[PDB]
Amino acid sequence: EGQISAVVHLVSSAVAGLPPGNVTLVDQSGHLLTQSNTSGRDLNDAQLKFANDVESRIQRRIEAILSPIVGNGNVHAQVTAQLDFANKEQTEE
Amino acid sequence: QFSEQVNYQRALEGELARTIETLGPVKSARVHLAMPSPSASVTVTLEPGRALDEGQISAVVHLVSSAVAGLPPGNVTLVDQSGHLLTQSNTSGRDLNDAQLKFANDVESRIQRRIEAILSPIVGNGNVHAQVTAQLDFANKEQTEEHYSPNGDASKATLRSRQLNISEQVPRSTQRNETSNYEVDRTIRHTKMNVGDIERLSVAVVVNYKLPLTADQMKQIEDLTREAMGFSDKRGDTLNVVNSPFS
Amino acid sequence: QFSEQVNYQRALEGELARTIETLGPVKSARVHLAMPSPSASVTVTLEPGRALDEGQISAVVHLVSSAVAGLPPGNVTLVDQSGHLLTQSNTSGRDLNDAQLKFANDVESRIQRRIEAILSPIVGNGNVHAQVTAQLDFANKEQTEEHYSPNGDASKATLRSRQLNISEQVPRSTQRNETSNYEVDRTIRHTKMNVGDIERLSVAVVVNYKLPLTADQMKQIEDLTREAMGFSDKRGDTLNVVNSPFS
Amino acid sequence: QFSEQVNYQRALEGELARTIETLGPVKSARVHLAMPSPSASVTVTLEPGRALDEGQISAVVHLVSSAVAGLPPGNVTLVDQSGHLLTQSNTSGRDLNDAQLKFANDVESRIQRRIEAILSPIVGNGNVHAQVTAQLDFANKEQTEEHYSPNGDASKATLRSRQLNISEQVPRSTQRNETSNYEVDRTIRHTKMNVGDIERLSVAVVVNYKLPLTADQMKQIEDLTREAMGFSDKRGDTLNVVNSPFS
């Protein structure tokens, strides 16, 4: 986690006008390693980080159960989770 | 009494400015406070050839908004050394309606990275491009249902009271009075909907040639993108993948 | 009275900041306090080339939240020495939402170690891999039953009062008035359900070859995993074990 | 009055901190208090290469919570010398929901040690492995029964009052009014159920070869494990023992 921030500032300062918040680091299988959020409705996109966490765990789980069978890098999985963020109470009687 | 609070406030402003100066790309700060409602105005002088990020403005905005009693982060005004009103919370117009464009860009970017991460193993590292347009629902929406189970059948009704008078004179003058009080099943759902869901997605994917890819391979590329969208015919999502040689 | 509190607060901020500075990867801190609502702002100067983890933020956030009267941990704003507004709980977006992910990971990890600890004696130390997905119920759920025993039979009813008037004129004008007051058996159960139970488990196990293991041996491997899950057809748990040579 | 309490508190924090420093594997401590609701924050610097156990954290937690009036043990924040918030009591998203996993691990570990201690004399010191999965009931559950004995029989009813008017004119105009007041037997049970009971156990036991153990010996191994579980078909416990050569 702290070795990606190393490179972000090594490039952000060596380039004129490029802040460290605009550099997007991506692995070789998705994995947006640089988390970026906004200054507005940021209550609303903690849900995107949450949905990314749910999807990332399911993704690591699939790539950990199939890597013994097919090989260490012969499988890629991407998971899209639709999540319910509605507040919802119910009273039966 | 007045000069007491003034000296207290006059030293905290100098204190806080010195604390903000020790923050990397900040050569000097200049926080002014207002407390008798409150508010504050910081005028940071950024280091030559740097720029505070968007979430790096909220860093300073909350470190000053919280170190002072009762000052929300929407009243803090950050200004660079060359105009640049960096705080858009000062926007008297909306400050809000266009945090939605940044949010919609985040949603679309994730779906786009997901499609480009599931197809880059098949077709190549740079032989596919996808663009996603998300229509999002930013309406505030509450709902209160209140359902009752029907008790028209007597074999599933629940009586609290029942007064059943039955007279019969035999010229057969009969009579049947019947008061019934019921207890009723009642469900009450209260939903407060989510602000920011997806009403509909439209995704366009271009895949390079290799030669035209086979129709079998294009069908399976379409199926993977359909699974990487979160495609739903309930939402009325639309997907179009074309195969075309790049430039 | 006023000058007392200002000097008190200015000296208390210096004490705690010096105690957190002596905490390993913290070269210098800079805590500001606000108390007349409250809040606090820490400005840690991390050691060059290190980074305090996420649960290492909660150490200091609560170390300051508790050393101050009435200051919750959600009002403390922690900022590193290079922007990075590290405490997003200020921007309250239900940081509760991902204690559920750590909890679900803990449940799944324990079930996984249990399966990998009961099968590693049979098939080998590394010839088995298991992954567990737990659907958990995090709904808050109260319930109040209230049962009554039926007293329709007269040989198990309990009377409190009974007024039975019986007239009979003999042209046989009879009459039978009967008021009855009952005492009723009553059970009242009040359950407050547990937040965090397992709704359903899906377990996938791969076992290595040796040669394909016998179908008899695979059946007994399935039974041990079924007992190490806590398998239940009421929950609709699903188990799939496959035998496949590793790489 | 204010300066009195500050000096008082500033000396008590130093006094208590010096006493906890003299406690073996603690090179230095650094307690901060919030006296005005209260709370406290200790920052112990353990001796190089040691670690306070879980019940050894409650030692210090109660040493500060009790030496201070009105300070509960849940507001005290223990921090190592490198972050490490050791008391999960501080991090409060759930903070209680996962004490259940530690509790369930304790229950399962005792049943596991019991099975491995009753079978290690028979089959060998290392020729048996057992894993136990306990489903536990953490629902809060109150119950109030209220039973009445039936008094429909006149030879076991208890009368308080009885007004029995019997008229008879002889054309035989009879009449029989009868008011009866009863005293009723009443049992009232009030149960507050235990949070943390065992709903169900699933136990898997593997025993090594020597050669396949005889079916008589496997039957008696099953009986001993069934008695070391606390096996009950009412709970729906499940046991599976397999005999398989180890590796």
PDB file of N, CA, C and O in Angstrom, chain D residues 122-149:
ATOM      1  N   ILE D 122      -6.398 -44.735  23.309  1.00  0.00           N
ATOM      2  CA  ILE D 122      -6.712 -45.945  22.557  1.00  0.00           C
ATOM      3  C   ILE D 122      -5.851 -46.044  21.309  1.00  0.00           C
ATOM      4  O   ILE D 122      -5.118 -47.020  21.113  1.00  0.00           O
ATOM      5  N   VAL D 123      -5.931 -45.040  20.441  1.00  0.00           N
ATOM      6  CA  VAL D 123      -5.365 -45.165  19.107  1.00  0.00           C
ATOM      7  C   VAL D 123      -3.939 -44.646  19.017  1.00  0.00           C
ATOM      8  O   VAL D 123      -3.215 -45.017  18.084  1.00  0.00           O
ATOM      9  N   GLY D 124      -3.512 -43.807  19.951  1.00  0.00           N
ATOM     10  CA  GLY D 124      -2.173 -43.260  19.937  1.00  0.00           C
ATOM     11  C   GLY D 124      -2.180 -41.766  20.173  1.00  0.00           C
ATOM     12  O   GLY D 124      -3.203 -41.092  20.090  1.00  0.00           O
ATOM     13  N   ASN D 125      -0.987 -41.253  20.469  1.00  0.00           N
ATOM     14  CA  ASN D 125      -0.865 -39.852  20.846  1.00  0.00           C
ATOM     15  C   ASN D 125      -1.187 -38.917  19.689  1.00  0.00           C
ATOM     16  O   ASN D 125      -1.694 -37.813  19.914  1.00  0.00           O
ATOM     17  N   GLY D 126      -0.910 -39.327  18.457  1.00  0.00           N
ATOM     18  CA  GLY D 126      -1.134 -38.447  17.328  1.00  0.00           C
ATOM     19  C   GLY D 126      -1.934 -39.072  16.208  1.00  0.00           C
ATOM     20  O   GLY D 126      -1.991 -38.528  15.103  1.00  0.00           O
ATOM     21  N   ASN D 127      -2.562 -40.213  16.475  1.00  0.00           N
ATOM     22  CA  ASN D 127      -3.310 -40.937  15.463  1.00  0.00           C
ATOM     23  C   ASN D 127      -4.776 -40.547  15.408  1.00  0.00           C
ATOM     24  O   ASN D 127      -5.586 -41.307  14.869  1.00  0.00           O
ATOM     25  N   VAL D 128      -5.146 -39.391  15.945  1.00  0.00           N
ATOM     26  CA  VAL D 128      -6.535 -38.958  15.883  1.00  0.00           C
ATOM     27  C   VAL D 128      -6.580 -37.443  15.779  1.00  0.00           C
ATOM     28  O   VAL D 128      -5.818 -36.735  16.443  1.00  0.00           O
ATOM     29  N   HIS D 129      -7.459 -36.951  14.914  1.00  0.00           N
ATOM     30  CA  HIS D 129      -7.740 -35.530  14.790  1.00  0.00           C
ATOM     31  C   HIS D 129      -9.240 -35.319  14.761  1.00  0.00           C
ATOM     32  O   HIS D 129      -9.969 -36.076  14.115  1.00  0.00           O
ATOM     33  N   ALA D 130      -9.699 -34.300  15.473  1.00  0.00           N
ATOM     34  CA  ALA D 130     -11.114 -33.986  15.561  1.00  0.00           C
ATOM     35  C   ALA D 130     -11.299 -32.503  15.305  1.00  0.00           C
ATOM     36  O   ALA D 130     -10.501 -31.685  15.768  1.00  0.00           O
ATOM     37  N   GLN D 131     -12.348 -32.154  14.570  1.00  0.00           N
ATOM     38  CA  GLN D 131     -12.742 -30.763  14.415  1.00  0.00           C
ATOM     39  C   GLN D 131     -14.211 -30.631  14.758  1.00  0.00           C
ATOM     40  O   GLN D 131     -15.026 -31.445  14.317  1.00  0.00           O
ATOM     41  N   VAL D 132     -14.548 -29.617  15.546  1.00  0.00           N
ATOM     42  CA  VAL D 132     -15.901 -29.433  16.048  1.00  0.00           C
ATOM     43  C   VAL D 132     -16.417 -28.090  15.566  1.00  0.00           C
ATOM     44  O   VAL D 132     -15.729 -27.074  15.704  1.00  0.00           O
ATOM     45  N   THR D 133     -17.616 -28.082  15.001  1.00  0.00           N
ATOM     46  CA  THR D 133     -18.304 -26.857  14.618  1.00  0.00           C
ATOM     47  C   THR D 133     -19.547 -26.708  15.488  1.00  0.00           C
ATOM     48  O   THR D 133     -20.438 -27.563  15.465  1.00  0.00           O
ATOM     49  N   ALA D 134     -19.583 -25.652  16.286  1.00  0.00           N
ATOM     50  CA  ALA D 134     -20.700 -25.375  17.175  1.00  0.00           C
ATOM     51  C   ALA D 134     -21.527 -24.231  16.614  1.00  0.00           C
ATOM     52  O   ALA D 134     -21.015 -23.125  16.424  1.00  0.00           O
ATOM     53  N   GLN D 135     -22.799 -24.501  16.347  1.00  0.00           N
ATOM     54  CA  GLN D 135     -23.781 -23.450  16.126  1.00  0.00           C
ATOM     55  C   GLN D 135     -24.320 -23.018  17.480  1.00  0.00           C
ATOM     56  O   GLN D 135     -24.875 -23.834  18.220  1.00  0.00           O
ATOM     57  N   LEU D 136     -24.173 -21.740  17.799  1.00  0.00           N
ATOM     58  CA  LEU D 136     -24.598 -21.222  19.085  1.00  0.00           C
ATOM     59  C   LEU D 136     -25.755 -20.248  18.928  1.00  0.00           C
ATOM     60  O   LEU D 136     -25.877 -19.555  17.916  1.00  0.00           O
ATOM     61  N   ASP D 137     -26.605 -20.211  19.946  1.00  0.00           N
ATOM     62  CA  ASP D 137     -27.762 -19.329  19.988  1.00  0.00           C
ATOM     63  C   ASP D 137     -27.393 -18.091  20.790  1.00  0.00           C
ATOM     64  O   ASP D 137     -27.242 -18.162  22.011  1.00  0.00           O
ATOM     65  N   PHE D 138     -27.251 -16.958  20.110  1.00  0.00           N
ATOM     66  CA  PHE D 138     -26.958 -15.696  20.771  1.00  0.00           C
ATOM     67  C   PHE D 138     -28.162 -14.769  20.812  1.00  0.00           C
ATOM     68  O   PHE D 138     -28.010 -13.574  21.074  1.00  0.00           O
ATOM     69  N   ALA D 139     -29.355 -15.290  20.564  1.00  0.00           N
ATOM     70  CA  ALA D 139     -30.548 -14.474  20.688  1.00  0.00           C
ATOM     71  C   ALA D 139     -30.876 -14.223  22.150  1.00  0.00           C
ATOM     72  O   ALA D 139     -30.825 -15.131  22.981  1.00  0.00           O
ATOM     73  N   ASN D 140     -31.226 -12.981  22.460  1.00  0.00           N
ATOM     74  CA  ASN D 140     -31.809 -12.650  23.748  1.00  0.00           C
ATOM     75  C   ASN D 140     -33.254 -13.102  23.760  1.00  0.00           C
ATOM     76  O   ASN D 140     -33.996 -12.844  22.812  1.00  0.00           O
ATOM     77  N   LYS D 141     -33.663 -13.770  24.825  1.00  0.00           N
ATOM     78  CA  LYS D 141     -34.928 -14.488  24.792  1.00  0.00           C
ATOM     79  C   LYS D 141     -35.503 -14.521  26.193  1.00  0.00           C
ATOM     80  O   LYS D 141     -34.933 -15.153  27.082  1.00  0.00           O
ATOM     81  N   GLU D 142     -36.621 -13.845  26.386  1.00  0.00           N
ATOM     82  CA  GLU D 142     -37.366 -13.926  27.624  1.00  0.00           C
ATOM     83  C   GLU D 142     -38.648 -14.696  27.377  1.00  0.00           C
ATOM     84  O   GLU D 142     -39.139 -14.774  26.254  1.00  0.00           O
ATOM     85  N   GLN D 143     -39.178 -15.285  28.434  1.00  0.00           N
ATOM     86  CA  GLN D 143     -40.419 -16.022  28.312  1.00  0.00           C
ATOM     87  C   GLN D 143     -41.165 -15.929  29.624  1.00  0.00           C
ATOM     88  O   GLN D 143     -40.558 -16.010  30.689  1.00  0.00           O
ATOM     89  N   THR D 144     -42.475 -15.738  29.547  1.00  0.00           N
ATOM     90  CA  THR D 144     -43.329 -15.749  30.727  1.00  0.00           C
ATOM     91  C   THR D 144     -44.507 -16.675  30.480  1.00  0.00           C
ATOM     92  O   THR D 144     -45.454 -16.301  29.789  1.00  0.00           O
ATOM     93  N   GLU D 145     -44.474 -17.865  31.060  1.00  0.00           N
ATOM     94  CA  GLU D 145     -45.676 -18.671  31.065  1.00  0.00           C
ATOM     95  C   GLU D 145     -46.586 -18.209  32.187  1.00  0.00           C
ATOM     96  O   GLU D 145     -46.173 -17.504  33.104  1.00  0.00           O
ATOM     97  N   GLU D 146     -47.848 -18.593  32.090  1.00  0.00           N
ATOM     98  CA  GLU D 146     -48.787 -18.355  33.178  1.00  0.00           C
ATOM     99  C   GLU D 146     -49.878 -19.406  33.053  1.00  0.00           C
ATOM    100  O   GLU D 146     -50.803 -19.251  32.259  1.00  0.00           O
ATOM    101  N   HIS D 147     -49.769 -20.454  33.847  1.00  0.00           N
ATOM    102  CA  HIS D 147     -50.659 -21.593  33.747  1.00  0.00           C
ATOM    103  C   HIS D 147     -51.733 -21.505  34.818  1.00  0.00           C
ATOM    104  O   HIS D 147     -51.515 -20.952  35.894  1.00  0.00           O
ATOM    105  N   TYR D 148     -52.903 -22.036  34.507  1.00  0.00           N
ATOM    106  CA  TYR D 148     -53.996 -22.149  35.455  1.00  0.00           C
ATOM    107  C   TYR D 148     -54.450 -23.595  35.510  1.00  0.00           C
ATOM    108  O   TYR D 148     -54.514 -24.268  34.481  1.00  0.00           O
ATOM    109  N   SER D 149     -54.756 -24.066  36.684  1.00  0.00           N
ATOM    110  CA  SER D 149     -55.291 -25.415  36.743  1.00  0.00           C
ATOM    111  C   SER D 149     -56.778 -25.391  36.411  1.00  0.00           C
ATOM    112  O   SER D 149     -57.498 -24.499  36.857  1.00  0.00           O
TER     113      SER D 149
END
